[PDB]
Amino acid sequence: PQITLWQRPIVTIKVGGQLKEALLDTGADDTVLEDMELPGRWKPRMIGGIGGFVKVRQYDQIPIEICGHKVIGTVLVGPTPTNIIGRNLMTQLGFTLNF
Amino acid sequence: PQITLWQRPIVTIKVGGQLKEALLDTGADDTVLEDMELPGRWKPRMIGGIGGFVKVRQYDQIPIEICGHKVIGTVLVGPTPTNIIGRNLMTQLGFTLNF
Numbered sequence A, B: 001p002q003i004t005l006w007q008r009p010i011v012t013i014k015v016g017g018q019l020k021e022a023l024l025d026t027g028a029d030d031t032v033l034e035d036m037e038l039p040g041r042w043k044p045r046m047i048g049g050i051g052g053f054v055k056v057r058q059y060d061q062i063p064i065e066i067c068g069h070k071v072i073g074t075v076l077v078g079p080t081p082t083n084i085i086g087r088n089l090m091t092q093l094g095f096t097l098n099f
């Protein structure tokens, strides 16, 4: 499908048995979700956003359902203005930018 | 053209007489560039993201060349860690996300 950008490109995700909304974010290398419970162990990760650097929780190999597709990969959990699906998972979906 | 997301989608822009590299950012509502001077009036603004908020100056109706194409719109200028082309300008090039 094709998604224009007059409004935020928000999609429904299913992660950790929870239905949420998230921003398709080509400016994000990594996927960052607001605080939630995920299984398994996490490791520390520091990410640099527009406001500076933040400690987040890195969970690896996490199943997420996005746009009718299952992806599996690294999900960072931490204080973010909004859930963001970064390039690590958008590539799993085969997203490209087109003009 | 079609731009991959395996790497950050960076493109060359021309703005304020100056050539720069910028991140195509579907996750960014507005275009924000690293501190520079732009002609005309501006209004102070705060934008929030991963690390918190940054204070920027908002210039309206600023001409920018992106991917060889001339567009106009709002440009926020401030202490962002990188130049970001937001949705407000990407729409004007008919940019879409496709999968």
Ligand SMILES: CC(C)CN(C[C@@H](O)[C@H](Cc1ccccc1)NC(=O)O[C@H]1CO[C@H]2OCC[C@H]21)S(=O)(=O)c1ccc(N)cc1
Pocket: A023, A025, A026, A027, A028, A029, A030, A031, A032, A047, A048, A049, A050, A051, A081, A082, A084, A086, B023, B025, B026, B027, B028, B029, B030, B031, B032, B047, B048, B049, B050, B081, B082, B084, B086
């Ligand atoms: C958090 C989003 C809702 C908004 N951010 C846009 C987003 O694309 C930023 C854009 C961005 C890009 C680089 C540096 C700072 C901000 N990326 C980002 O925070 O990514 C972090 C998560 O993965 C990592 O990969 C890149 C940085 C890390 S934002 O930069 O804060 C932002 C907010 C408002 C406007 N107008 C413009 C930009």
